[PDB]
Design a binder for these strands. Structure first.
Ligand SMILES: [Mg+2]
Length: 119
RNA sequence: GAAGCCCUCACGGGCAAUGUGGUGUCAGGGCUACCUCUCAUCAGCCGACCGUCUCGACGAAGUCUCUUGGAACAGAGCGUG
């Protein structure tokens, strides 16, 4: 909400999650806000996901601007439990980072484009 | 970075990426490359002596003489641990 400056259409979010699932199987992904933050800082992040139902918002507030000054692309997901399930967790996840996609580097790279265009 | 914890005989359930657990805590630590090494620390097992306080068992040698007296545990005499 305060850290969300653009709305991601339902369909875009699905493509994103889908890509994330093939990422945990084919490539590499980081689950959890602390491990995600470190990707963006270490530059190893290619696409970071951030839930929008995070309370307190403090936990994720920094992702956006941090991602911006690091060139890393990011996309918002409405449900926290969807991101966690997509990432492969039995629990939810406030943030995730596809650390080097897998059999999705295409669809992925394009999701990053659609979002950059989503302003 | 799920390698973790709780409940339950089990099955099974719950917690946990908003981080369970590993590492680590100024002899600073982590990371990288090395040297040596552990006897520090932490976790868990076993598990007292002595002392002190109280309680309890066992525990030596006269119940002799005369006098006074209601009564000798008194006086005089003899004897014991
Ligand atoms: Mg510890």
């Amino acid at each position: 909400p305060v850290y969300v400056d653009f709305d991601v259409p339902a369909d875009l979010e699905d493509d994103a999650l889908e890509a994330l699932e093939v990422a945990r199987d084919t490539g590499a992904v980081k689950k959890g806000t602390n491990e995600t933050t470190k990707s963006i800082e270490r530059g190893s992040a290619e696409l970071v996901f951030v839930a929008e139902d995070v309370q307190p918002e403090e936990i994720v507030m920094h992702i956006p601007e941090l991602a911006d000054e690091k060139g890393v692309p990011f996309i918002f997901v409405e449900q926290q439990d969807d991101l966690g399930h997509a990432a492969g967790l039995e629990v939810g996840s406030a943030a995730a980072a596809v650390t080097d996609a897998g059999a999705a580097a295409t669809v992925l790279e394009e999701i990053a484009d659609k979002v950059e265009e989503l302003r």
